[PDB]
């Protein structure tokens, strides 16, 4: 490349919120992070993350069918 | 906060009770 102007690439170990140790060579020797390829909800299964709701309960608001038959 | 529903004297001004001004001694 060109010498003296380009940065140097050092071993970089990224620690995650779940404790994942990511194994790269980069421009800072130890990295803190808060996500990885596993904690992001789109990556792995999506596991009814926060919703458990098909919609708001439009056709499900009945809460007891109480009328005259 | 005489109009704020989530402070003390807003509940005192309208005379309504709840979390932010309960009546208990």
């Amino acid at each position: 490349m060109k010498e003296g102007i380009h940065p140097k690439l050092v071993p970089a170990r990224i620690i995650c919120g779940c404790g994942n140790v990511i194994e790269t060579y980069s421009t800072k020797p130890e990295i803190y992070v808060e996500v990885c390829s596993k904690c992001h909800p789109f990556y792995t299964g999506q596991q009814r993350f926060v919703d458990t709701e098909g919609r708001v309960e439009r056709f499900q608001r009945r809460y007891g069918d109480s009328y005259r038959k | 906060g005489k109009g704020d529903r989530r402070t003390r004297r807003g509940k005192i001004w309208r005379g309504t009770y709840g979390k932010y001004r309960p009546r208990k001694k």
């Binding site: 380009h6 940065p7 690439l9 990511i22 790269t24 421009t27 990885c36 789109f42 990556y43 | -």
Partner: protein
């Protein structure tokens, strides 16, 4: 030569799977990931060359190699841009420096896009290549939020030796790109 993970992940996961799915008969008929390009287009640097050096330092911090300017080729009346006036900052990525950047991107930076609903799989040119753009630079773990100044973001051009769009689709998906279905 280096023990970068996505290169070996390519060779042992995505390289035979693309032979299996499409029926390749030569080892170089597989799609190959070469010449990742970043142009970080700073059209807001018409009046200032001092933001350009900080953006060059940040780009050299996140990819390991220092970008070049892009000189304007053609002046316009609406947007000042006379002859020169450097308002761009282009860097291309090769030879284990695209791979560490793709590790950074796919594992850290893309989950730090806000709500990150997926990608656009319709963003294919027709001849095996792909382009995407980033909004903020704080998604990369090398950007520190206390050495930052401004809301400077990115356009990434990734090139593949694939002939069609469906080949690069399966190469990007299996190597770790989070497209929408």
């Amino acid at each position: 030569p280096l023990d970068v993970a996505l290169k070996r992940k390519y060779y042992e996961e995505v390289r035979p799977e693309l032979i299996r799915r499409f029926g390749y008969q030569n080892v170089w008929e597989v799609p190959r990931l070469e010449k990742v390009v970043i142009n970080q287009g700073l059209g807001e640097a018409k009046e200032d060359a001092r933001i350009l050096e900080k953006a060059a330092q940040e780009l050299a911090l996140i990819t390991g190699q220092k970008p070049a300017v892009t000189r304007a080729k053609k002046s316009i009346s609406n947007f000042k841009l006379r002859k020169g006036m450097p308002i761009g900052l282009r860097v291309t990525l090769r030879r284990d420096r695209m791979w560490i950047f793709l590790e950074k991107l796919l594992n850290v930076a893309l989950p730090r896009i806000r709500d990150f609903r997926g990608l656009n799989p319709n963003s294919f040119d027709g001849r095996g290549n792909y382009n995407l753009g980033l909004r903020e630079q704080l998604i990369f773990p090398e950007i520190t939020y206390d050495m930052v100044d401004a809301l400077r973001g990115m356009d990434i051009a990734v090139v593949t030796t694939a002939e069609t769009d469906e080949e690069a689709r399966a190469l990007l998906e299996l190597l770790g790109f989070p497209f929408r279905k």
